[PDB]
Design a protein around this ligand. Sequence first.
Ligand SMILES: NC(=[NH2+])NCCC[C@H](N)C(=O)O
Length: 238
Amino acid sequence: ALPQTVRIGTDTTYAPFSSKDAKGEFIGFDIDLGNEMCKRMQVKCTWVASDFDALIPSLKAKKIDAIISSLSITDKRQQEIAFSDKLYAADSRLIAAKGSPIQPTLESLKGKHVGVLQGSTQEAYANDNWRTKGVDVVAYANQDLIYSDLTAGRLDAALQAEVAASEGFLKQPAGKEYAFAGPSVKDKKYFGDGTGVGLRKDDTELKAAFDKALTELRQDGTYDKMAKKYFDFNVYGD
Ligand SMILES: NC(=[NH2+])NCCC[C@H](N)C(=O)O
């Protein structure tokens, strides 16, 4: 009972996972994964762009059928929605101006303005640990606004996925003056364990079909060859 067309929501402002090229086409590792899974599922798929914080609400409202948007698999989210098996890992890390003394600690970030994606696990962490304790945490509709406000000096630092920042900003023209500030931050509760396809809890058949296609594309080496387009390391993690 899979839909004739699976509607997949994604936030196209998170290179190299999900973004738009110059003529508006969806590109990145999430898009590649989704399209490959849809192929093996033998279903048509329609990509739907949305701000990140609108994805889970759109899913719950059945305006989309799935989310592939670096969606972290967390205990909290598992109470509202279901997930496919892990698509890849996604650690979190701060960036700031090169040579910045900033570390991902309250003491370091006091007085600093820190940008986070609204609706993200990074926002959850930053709100609880930093915002409550006086740090000017600013939440943004999308990650592109964060990068812009950073380079415009409205932000001192920003918290997002390590790989997104690296491949999508630090290794891009806009980020040549910026670097990681401190190590990545582990936090079981807030950050979860990898990303997955977000799905409605009752769509058992759809989850089975994604899980099946995902295992198959990992079995035959397609995952690693697709990954190699973007990463020279183990993006899957454990
Ligand atoms: N396409 C995106 N904007 N992805 C952002 C994901 C941020 C983080 N992994 C989360 O699940 O909250």
